[PDB]
Amino acid sequence: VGLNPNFSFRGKQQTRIETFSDAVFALAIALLVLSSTIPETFEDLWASMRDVIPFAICVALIIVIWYQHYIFFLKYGLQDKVTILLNTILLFVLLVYVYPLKFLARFLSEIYGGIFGIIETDLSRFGEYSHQNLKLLMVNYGLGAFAIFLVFSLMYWRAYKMKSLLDLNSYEIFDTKSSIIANLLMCSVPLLSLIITLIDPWGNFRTTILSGFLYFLYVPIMIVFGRITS
Amino acid sequence: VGLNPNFSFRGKQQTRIETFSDAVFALAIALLVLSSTIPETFEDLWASMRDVIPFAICVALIIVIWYQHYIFFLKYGLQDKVTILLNTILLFVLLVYVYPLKFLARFLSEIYGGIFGIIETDLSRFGEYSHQNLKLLMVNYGLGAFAIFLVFSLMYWRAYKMKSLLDLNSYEIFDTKSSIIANLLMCSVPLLSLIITLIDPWGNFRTTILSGFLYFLYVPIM
Amino acid sequence: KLVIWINGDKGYNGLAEVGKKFEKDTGIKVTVEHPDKLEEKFPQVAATGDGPDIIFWAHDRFGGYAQSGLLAEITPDKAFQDKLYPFTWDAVRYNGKLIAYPIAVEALSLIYNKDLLPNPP
Amino acid sequence: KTWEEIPALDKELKAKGKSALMFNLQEPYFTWPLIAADGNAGAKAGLTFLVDLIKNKHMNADTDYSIAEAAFNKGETAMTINGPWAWSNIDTSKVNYGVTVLPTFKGQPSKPFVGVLSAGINAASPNKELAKEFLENYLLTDEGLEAVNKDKPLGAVALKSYEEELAKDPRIAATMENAQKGEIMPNIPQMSAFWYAVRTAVINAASGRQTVDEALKDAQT
Ligand SMILES: OC[C@H]1O[C@H](O[C@H]2[C@H](O)[C@@H](O)[C@@H](O)O[C@@H]2CO)[C@H](O)[C@@H](O)[C@@H]1O
């Protein structure tokens, strides 16, 4: 049922923090889709169906965050001020990046649409694709991703700080320690793009290519950390 | 209380996946209605009252999905990655067909309104009803319905794959197997309309007319 | 004395509790024995000596006993016959004669520790 | 989490008719972690703090194993310093207890001495082979150590087969945490004279006879 067979799930009962959180995750994925205009004609209907690829990418991304949230609150059943604070920071970041994700997802769907040869529609709608704007694109979304994983690391550290109060066993202590490392390692990749973009070594699009290409190198580093624990 | 007296309901306690899901079903049916503009004059009010027939159709359709969801999570109490994945795909499909259904329900509510003789308002409001558009319509809402029943079949198959972990008895195994068949049989009707509209045997409205008729004979064709 | 031979991995204590209710309603003793290698000790002892009155084993060993003449033909009335599944009676039939009473179908399964292994092979 | 924040906590608790920390001050094994937290300059720092606790009336002068144990189990003190063996008596009482890392002193951790409970055979015994049988085939077995452990906990057993059961216990985790922050005692013959030197030194400074500087002078000799 769960991630670890040695973990004793303290948060099987639903709480207010989790109920509130569920609404906000639902509210996020739901308003991402339902923020669109209602089709009034066949032309609008076909236009609206072009949005499903961008939405699928966004939704997939948000549930992945929801899953990590579900697992944390399941593991520790925490409900204190500091957990509430860190939880709010998380939902706050999520919320401010919902509509920007809708944007990024639509933009990248057009770029990848052009490449594969499915469509040939204009990108002038997005408003001047300049070096400064494409750099700010990385820095923005990179700063968002870094923060989410940074907060997950802080949340696990708060549970680690309360290990004795939570009666955590050697397996659970190890999991908690590994979960901190995992989230800091996850955060490192957007932190590395963001830094590369902010320095801008090449002074041109090359910077943005490299910054974007680091997301493709998540998979190998994740495998190293997974292999080390096994 | 439940569907089967021989089934032991593992999901009587509410979980996060079910709470999140409930918000999204509510968020769907609620934003379908409340996506409309607030009437500022009687003219705007009487217009939003025409919209209730399509809303009733839509709401009825969404709770039917919510019911199937309620029964699945009640039966197995599942909460694993794969169940989360399949559950997300479902809510994703739902969410994409909320505003499209608001449109189809309005589109049919106008056509069927004209037939019965309740109203006599135009269908040019819907912007060219060409063969390709009315074909694409049946391919769209047919692809949506197929993919919702397809997902319900996958969800029941995931429970069947975990039969021993869930300690399912002979009655429960039978129910699970029957629920897979039911959902694949439900999915087959939209899969047929969709294939008819795509192949297009007649090359004219004879195709689209049939594609809509296969849903009216859901029970008999099953 | 009513003597029954059944394997030691089965429920002989429970079979004895049935035997204890039999003695209350009749007066006959019902001892339940579980000797080692009873499947190959029965056809040697039952042929020559007395051995048991009733022998319990999977149906596969009974055809050999039937050919050798070590088992009485079973003659159960329709009403008793009807209480058991007709497929079960077929397993206890050798050359159109019922050679035993069917009790239960047995098959090996994979028994696993859910704590050490939640999703077994 | 720190030793230096106990006086504040004690002021808070004494108002409500409760002590903060009560532990065995007579036996030096209990006071050594605080003394050895920094280290000499480290022993002088650690002991002066311990002396200031008794001088500020936070701890009693003649606090022994029994009155400390009893006070914690009764629910009079909020904290105590003890080993695995002490847990069973707490379980007997109706006290929701926790076992955790020892407090830090001067930022650095308090280094508790680590002991390995060990069974030795007396050289002047005729039953040497009978004792070897008992120790190997009956005591140092899963079943054997279980019996001892359900009476009064042994701590982290030396048996390889007991790793899973040890790891499932939160108190063992806290014990291993402190054991890593501490160090294993050398077995050397001088340990006896050492322990006696520390036992007197701590008692003299606690009661109010010898100074902290003069305690380490007499102890190093
Ligand atoms: O107090 C000094 C004393 O400490 C250690 O003894 C411990 C013993 O190891 C524990 O098992 C526990 O019972 O308490 C004893 C102290 O009260 C040293 O092992 C010993 O040499 C030394 O005298």
Residue numbers in the entry:
A (entry chain B): 9 to 238
B (entry chain E): 9 to 230
C (entry chain D): 123 to 243
D (entry chain A): 244 to 282, 302 to 483
What did the study's authors say about this model?
In crystal soaking experiments with the T38A mutant of MtTMEM175 we could not detect anomalous signal for Zn, even when using concentrations of 2.5 mM (0.5–2.5 mM tested) and contouring of the anomalous signal at 4σ and 2σ. This supports an attraction for Zn2+ ions in the pore in close distance to, or directly at the selectivity filter and indicates that the T38A mutation changes the electrostatic environment in the pore. Indeed, the T38A mutant of MtTMEM175 retained its sensitivity for Zn2+; in WT and the mutant channel Zn2+ caused at a reference voltage of −60 mV the same relative inhibition (WT 66.9 ± 12%, T38A mutant 69.7 ± 10 n = 4). This suggests that the bacterial channel is inhibited by Zn2+ through a different mechanism, that is not a pore block. However, our functional analysis does not support the idea that Zn2+ is blocking MtTMEM175 by the same mechanism as hTMEM175.
The TMEM175 channel was found to mediate a major K+ permeability of lysosomes and late endosomes (hence also named KEL), and is not related to canonical K+ channels. The vertebrate TMEM175 proteins are composed of two homologous non-identical repeats, each comprising six transmembrane domains forming dimers; the bacterial homologues consist of only one such repeat and form tetramers. We obtained a crystal structure at a resolution of 2.4 Å of a TMEM175 channel from Marivirga tractuosa (MtTMEM175) and in combination with functional analysis, propose how selectivity for K+ ions is achieved. Each MtTMEM175 subunit is composed of six transmembrane helices which assemble to form a tetrameric channel as verified using SEC-MALLS of uncomplexed MtTMEM175.
